[PDB]
Symmetry: C3
Subunit: 196 residues, 3 copies
C-alpha cells in the first residue's frame, strides 16, 4: 500500500523510518525532503547545493520541483512509506508541508501521524542539540508541541475529506519501559497495517 | 431544509432518526449506508454480501455507487435528514463516510453532529451487544474530534452549517438525550 | 503582505485593528463586513438600510456582494489586514464567514487567529453592553466560546490545506497583569510579523 508518515520534528520519526526499512523487504521508505533536495540539485545546480537551499527561490519554482519529486515517488511499485511533515512552524504561522498535487500524484491510501508526549519531544530535541544537531532551533514549550500536533491532525483530516484517504493516529505518548520502545511499537503497528 | 445527521456509532443516532420519522412528517429520514449497501448488491451481486465488503471494491467502483446512492436521495423534496457517519474507524485508521461529490449532489444546508459522553457510549454499546446487536473513552473522544474536523472541512469546502448538539450531560430520566436531540432538530427545521 | 485577521466577536479584535493602523505606517486595515455593507447599499439601497438587513437578500446575490467586496479589497497594494470572522454562530449552527472566492481573489499570505480566555470574552462582551454598544445580552457560556474557538482553528487549517497559506495562532489567553495588555501584545506580535 501507500502511506504518508508524519509527526512533529526531532521526536523519533526518522528512527521509525530507518527501522521500518530494516524489518520489511517489500517496502520502500522514501523521505520526501530528500527527493525534493535531489530533484532540486538536478534542475538548477549553481542555485542549489545544500539542503536549506531549497527555500530561497520563489514558490513557483519550488512548487514545480515538489510536483516532480512526487511523480518519481509515484514510479515506486511495492509498499511505500513517504516520510514527510503535515506542517512547519514559521514566524508567519504554520505552513502546510504538502501541496495538493503531492497527494494526487502519490494517491496514498492514508496518512499516519506519530503523536508523541511533548516532554519526550523536549528531552530528545535537547539531547540532540547537545550532541550537535538542529542548532539555533527555538526551544519549544509543552503547549507549542501540543498545538503543533493538533494542527497536524486538522491538516490530515482536511486532506482526507478532499482525497478520500485513511487517517491513522498512533499513540506514542505513554511512558517507555525501555529506550526506543516508542519507535518499536510504532514500527510494529505500521507493519501490522501493511500485512493485514 | 436538508441536513446530514451524524455521530459515533452505537450511541443513539438511530433512536433519534426513528423519533424524527415518528414526530415530523413532511420529512424523509434516509439511512445513507442502507442505500449504498443495497445499490452495491444490485451492481456487484457476487463480490458484496457483507456491508464490510464495500471497500473490497476498487476505488472507482466504490465512488460510483456512492454517487448513484446520492442521486436517488438528491431527487427527494420537502425537509430531508440523511443519517450517516462522518467517519468510521478501521485497522488503517479513520475513513470518511461521504465523498466530495456526495455533498454537492445532495446540496445539504448543514451537518448535524450528535455528541455524547463517551461513558454513556461504552455503556450503550455494551447494553445493545448483550441483546444481540472494544473502544475506551479516549478512543471515543478522538473519534468525536475527528468527526468535528471532517464536518468543518466539509463546511469550508461547500459553505454549509455545522451544528454540534451537546448530549454529554447526565440524564435526569432515561431517553432524555434523545428527546433533547429531536427537539433541537425539529426546532431547526421549523425556524 | 496580506493577512486575514479573525477572532470571536466582542473580545478585542477591533481594538487591535485600530491600534495597528495608528502605529505602523502605510498599513491598510479593512473590515470585510463594513465593505460588504457599503456594497449592499450601492447595489440594493431600497431594501438594506441597516447592515443587519442583508439576511433577506437571496443567498445567491449576497454571495455576489462578498465577491465584489473581495474584488475591491484586492486592489490595495501596501501591507494589508482584513478584519473578519472565520465563523459565526447561527441557530442552524456555525457558518463560515469567508467564501472561496474571497481567498483566491484576495490571495492572503496568512490567517491570524486571536485566541482569548473565555472569561475575558464574557467580561468584555458585558462591559460593552453597559457602554450602550449592543442592545441585547450575550448568553454564550465559557464552553460555548472554547467550542467557537476550536471550530475557528479547523476552518483556518482547512483554508490553509486548500489555499496553501500560513495559519498564525496568537495566544491571548494568559491573565492580564495590567489593562489592555492583550491588545498591546497582539499588536506588537502582528507588527513584528509584517517587518520580518
Ligand atoms: N535516549 C533516547 N533517545 C531517543 C528515544 N527515542 C528517540 N530518541 C532520539 O530522539 C532523536 C529523534 O530524532 P529524529 O528521529 O532524527 O527526527 P527527524 O524527524 O528525522 O528530524 P528532521 O530531519 O528535522 O525532520 C534521536 O536523536 C533519537 O536517538 C529514546 O527512547 N531514548
Ligand atoms: N468501522 C466501524 N464501523 C462501525 C462500527 N460500529 C458501527 N459501524 C457502522 O455502523 C453501521 C450500522 O449502524 P450503527 O452505526 O451500528 O447504528 P447508529 O446509526 O449509530 O445508532 P444506534 O444503534 O442507536 O447507536 C454499519 O454499516 C457499520 O459500518 C465500528 O466500530 N467500526
Ligand atoms: N477594560 C478593558 N477592556 C478591554 C480590554 N481589552 C479589550 N477590551 C474591550 O473589549 C471590548 C471589545 O473590543 P473589540 O472587539 O475590539 O470591539 P467591537 O467592535 O465591540 O467587537 P468586534 O469587532 O466584533 O471584536 C471593547 O469594549 C474593548 O475596549 C482591557 O484590557 N480592559
Amino acid at each position: 500500500m501507500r502511506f504518508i508518515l508524519t509527526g512533529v520534528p526531532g521526536a523519533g520519526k526518522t528512527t521509525v523510518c530507518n527501522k521500518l526499512a530494516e524489518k520489511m523487504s517489500n517496502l520502500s521508505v522514501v523521505n520526501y525532503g530528500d527527493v525534493i533536495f535531489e530533484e532540486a540539485k538536478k534542475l538548477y545546480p549553481s542555485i542549489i547545493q545544500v539542503r536549506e537551499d531549497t527555500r530561497k527561490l520563489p514558490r513557483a519554482d519550488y512548487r514545480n520541483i515538489q510536483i516532480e519529486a512526487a511523480k518519481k515517488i509515484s514510479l515506486i511499485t511495492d509498499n511505500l512509506i513517504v516520510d514527510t511533515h503535515m506542517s512547519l512552524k514559521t514566524p508567519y504561522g504554520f505552513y502546510p508541508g504538502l501541496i495538493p498535487e503531492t497527494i494526487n500524484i502519490i494517491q496514498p491510501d492514508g496518512i499516519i501521524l506519530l503523536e508523541f508526549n511533548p516532554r519526550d519531544v523536549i528531552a530528545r530535541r535537547e539531547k540532540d542539540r547537545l550532541a550537535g544537531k538542529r542548532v539555533t532551533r527555538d526551544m519549544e514549550s509543552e503547549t507549542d508541541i501540543l498545538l503543533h500536533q493538533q494542527v497536524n491532525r486538522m491538516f490530515a483530516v482536511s486532506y482526507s475529506a478532499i482525497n478520500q484517504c485513511y487517517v491513522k493516529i498512533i499513540d506514542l505518548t505513554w511512558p517507555q519501559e525501555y529506550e526506543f520502545q516508542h519507535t518499536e511499537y510504532a514500527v510494529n503497528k505500521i507493519i501490522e497495517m501493511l500485512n493485514f
